[PDB]
Amino acid sequence: LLTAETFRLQFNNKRRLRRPYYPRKALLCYQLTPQNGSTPTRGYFENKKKCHAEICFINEIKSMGLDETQCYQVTCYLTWSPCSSCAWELVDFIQAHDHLNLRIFASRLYYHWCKPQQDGLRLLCGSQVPVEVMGFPEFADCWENFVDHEKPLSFNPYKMLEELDKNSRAIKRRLDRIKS
Amino acid sequence: NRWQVMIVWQVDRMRINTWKRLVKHHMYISRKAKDWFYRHHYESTHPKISSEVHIPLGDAKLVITTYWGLHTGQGVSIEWRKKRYSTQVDPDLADQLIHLHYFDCFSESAIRNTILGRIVSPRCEYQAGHNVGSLQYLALAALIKPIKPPLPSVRKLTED
Amino acid sequence: SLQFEDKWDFMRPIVLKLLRQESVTKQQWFDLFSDVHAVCLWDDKGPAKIHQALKEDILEFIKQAQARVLSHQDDTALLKAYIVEWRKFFTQCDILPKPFCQLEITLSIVRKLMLDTWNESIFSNI
Amino acid sequence: MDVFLMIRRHKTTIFTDAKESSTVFELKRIVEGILKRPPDEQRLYKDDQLLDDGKTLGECGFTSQTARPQAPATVGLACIEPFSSP
Amino acid sequence: MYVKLISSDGHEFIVKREHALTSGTIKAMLSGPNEVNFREIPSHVLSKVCMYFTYKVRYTNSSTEIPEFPIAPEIALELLMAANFLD
């Protein structure tokens, strides 16, 4: 799984990134909850060559197998949100599979100033898939979920989480105003 | 070997280009077709699909697919989809199903106002959505004659 | 234009003959159909004024029926009167709703109006 | 597409359908019998040719495109009474 | 079985019962307490109504070609009223 340093660096939601100029890469943290009683299933994927994180996630969920008549709640925290090709592949996959309630949570928007990306996000919202910006609750959830806290770390996560939540207001407003 | 069979109506380049231009104009420049969708040729993994226009009707949708590399080549296909259930749809029924939700039609109290000579505000400029109905509509259309950029019609694109 | 003035009174004898199972010629039926359409079309205050007129007419007929059956307070007399009156309601619920088809188009309802009037006058009372 | 026809006997304006090349007797066997008239003492007419008596489906074989349900072609029987106008 | 609709001018149009059952007004008018008389519809409009009855009962089943009904506009308005009485 992830790392505390990896979490704080790769899940940034700011528009500054300070003087150091490490690159931010799209990541997917998916979690499964079935209503039968099985434990939530946790996973994370990167933008492997060609296989964007979303597409990899789709292939993973298709390959690992699940019952068709049991409704499953899937939530994916995407670092960069889905692109237009991913916005269409995910829409098609979620229309094909009826029993999957998909919740996409984006820490920041991917080329939100371009028209096709806005249309893809509107498509995702319209086709039963609610895509919303990360706020403090999901930031904290994916913090204590997808990170091992055994190792020592600097920068108290309390501050980390509050910093991320504070950064995640302008982009929340941008997403709320981007749907039309 | 496994196959999937589906009906493609062969069209030439000019008509497909005109349909794409009209749907793009009314999606963005105009306001009638804002609720539709569009899947460009680079957003799909199908080697032959050049475009896909999605028209959401209620909880279902209508998908119009335009193809790349057929013979005697390209073509247009129409499908009606509702939660993994899909049917082939002819151009006339496609237009009729489109007109049910999107483009303005005569109001409920439109026959009466015309009967007394009163003005009727909401008309029906999408004639292609009406293919036999009732004599009231025929008389009304013969009474009032009902757009500079033509509206997107599936039957005109899928002509010949 | 011409709605409910010199028009509803024209069909009032026809309405009360249609009620109570009184013989009415077909030509009168066609005339009443035309008059109902003209009333519901020319000024459109049909599903309200025709509604009130039909409601008061059916209520008056129900009251007259109660007056004519209270003279038959005997249990056997009450039962036979109820039987013949149920035949009357069957015939009226069959025939009366048809002329007021345009009531549904604008907004039958006369059948359920008669149903609730009979429920209040008879079913609720007895 | 079978031919569609209307017969104008003065006021009466019967409407019916017939085959593309059906004989006149098939036109006036039972179809005219609705008027309670047997084939005897009855003869069809058509414009000015008068159709003679019957059995000749050649001249009576009106083309389908010439007589549509939207605009059926008159026949006549015996004068006709023209329709009124607003 | 053929019904005989009489217009306001006395012009009797005889039509098939299933063709004249298209309009709900006729279907409700006939059954109850044959032949149907009218007080307002003239001959030149009842004729068009019967023509439309035939045209619709013929072309409703068709799904490929639907030829247009030729309606003269100068009378269409009046025709509309008659249609509003029937359909």
Next chain:
Amino acid sequence: DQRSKFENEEFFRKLSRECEIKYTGFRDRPHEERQARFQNACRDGRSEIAFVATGTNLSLQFFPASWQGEQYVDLVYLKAPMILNGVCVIWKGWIDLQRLDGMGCLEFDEERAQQEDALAQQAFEEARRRTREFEDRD
């Protein structure tokens, strides 16, 4: 009413009449070579084949399964089950036994009609039957 719908609606009457079907393709190539390409395309299902119905723009297109995602069809065995206009049908014909031309028509798919889901079918039925005209409140 799916079973009855085939016998009267004109679309199926014109579609199911043993229509002549001609393969469209590499007609520019020599006829012997062209029928060789058709044979080797039918041999391994890794291409598309279109039949033009000989007179209309309507064409039946056979694409390989693995072209629109993974999610019976033969190839005298030209069985093509689909759901046309809301009713399950099978386009059946023969073109592969001959060189490059043949016959093709429609037959009812009773098995697919029974196996098809009900809610969406009646939803489409209500969508098709109803008319937009004079429906908006005013």
Next chain:
RNA sequence: AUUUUUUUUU
């Protein structure tokens, strides 16, 4: 490190 413009401060 997804880009452009605008505003304030040093």
Next chain:
RNA sequence: AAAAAAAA
């Protein structure tokens, strides 16, 4: 040259 904010 650097920091913070808003919009596309």
